[PDB]
Amino acid sequence: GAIKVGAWGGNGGSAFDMGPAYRIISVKIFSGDVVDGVDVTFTYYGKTETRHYGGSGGTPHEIVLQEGEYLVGMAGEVANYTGAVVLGKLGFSTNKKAYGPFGNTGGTPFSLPIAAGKISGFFGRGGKFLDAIGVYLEPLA
Template sequence: MFLSQQNDMNTVFWWFPHQQPAHQRRMVASSKVIRVGPWGGRGGSPWDDGPHRGVRSITLAYSRFLESMTVEYVDRSGRPVYGEKHGGGTSRSRSEKVPLIPNQVVCARSMHVSSIFVCNGQLIDDIWVQIELDFPYEFVTGVSGRYQEVHVGSLPVVRSLTFTTSRGKVHGPFGYDEGTPFAYPMEGGVVVGFTGRSSWHVDALGLYVAALRPETLCDVVHERGLSAYRSFVYGGGGARYPQQQQQQQQQYGTTAQHHQAKRPFEWCYK
């Protein structure tokens, strides 16, 4: 038991994360973030997905360079947030519904194939890949890649990307592994957002990074609202630890019932 919370009614509630299986113990990203990067060139227009609670999937299109990037995030309430597509001025749009298989490379060939890239022995326009993470039990913990000019004398763009997750998985490199390298490995930190520049390609890429910490009762309250209050205090539907909750009821039941008229766990919102 690592957390106790006390409100103005002197009611104490306990959170027992050690009761969860170790491989399913929930970790959350801190709300305090830092912005690092970007790496790449100064071409294109700036974009900023902003920081979120975590990353659920990353979709890339690439050939000789990183053509486009789309990220699905998760907000503080656990709802999906779909970022805009960045780059892709010459690659096919996601609206064309290229069939994607999670964590597998898909060769994309259009009617106007320019035959600039080889995929599974075929000349194609670009390659698509969708990286799926098992959020909230898996996070992006490292990003690396390379950037280089498109032509001699032009501004650099991102040529390849590699992602490492909290489960030790390595996805990539996706693209040409040539050019100036960059890397941002994180020990105890995770990626919660992306920023950068893009036009025809992804010109530059930056990160929002946050520390990873164990989930607290207030995190559950923000995600589940009143249902969390009933589950953790009164042992209602969806309760995780009924034995401990019954003990809480016996010790703090009268005060908790008096407090129910007030906003549940109001200190979590301060």
């Protein structure tokens, strides 16, 4: 868990920190006007777990990673929504396809292309919505 980039977003809400997973199985992005939160399902030290960060409003959009598929990009926009500085839009790329945007509120763009390596986990801040998000990076095996 030595390489953490981000977080992008605001200073509100409460901190979360997943740490790195052995393998990410799926990510669900909950969104409506903004990004409400994320589920991450993953393997970890012999266990399989699901963790939820942020709120649970909006609609879930699930990206299931197939055998040999991994996350190689994240991008989005940081927006003001109802006075909260949050992820207004969020998306992800795998080595196969890009997904998103999830959310509808424009703001300040950010983008993280990973030319070598993969996203292995998440940290950030959450409340009613997803205030901020960053990622753990690991090399490819």
